[PDB]
């Protein structure tokens, strides 16, 4: 059952009782991540094993 997800990267720690549903690709560096990929660009959502 991999339907359970979780967020691994964020700009900053979310405040208490905050729901985040953003799906934008996460960039590790300062350079922009145009398109669907980029330098060190990875999807911030990973399934549960």
């Amino acid at each position: 059952n991999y339907n359970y997800l979780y967020r691994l990267f964020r700009k900053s720690n979310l405040k208490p009782f905050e729901r985040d549903i953003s799906t934008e690709i996460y960039q590790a560096g300062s350079t922009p991540c145009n398109g669907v990929e980029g330098f060190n660009c990875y999807f911030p959502l990973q399934s549960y094993g």
Partner: protein, 49 residues
Amino acid sequence: YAWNRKRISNCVADYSVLYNSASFSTFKCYGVSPTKLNDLCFTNVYADS
């Protein structure tokens, strides 16, 4: 079987070049993060090849 171990001291263990360098593709820090590595100090680093 004879992997080296070089203790590093009396010299700044700069890591900006690693971030600046585009040759590296995979870089994961499971104990720390580059963002807080700026104000985080390590007693000594061993270069094992």
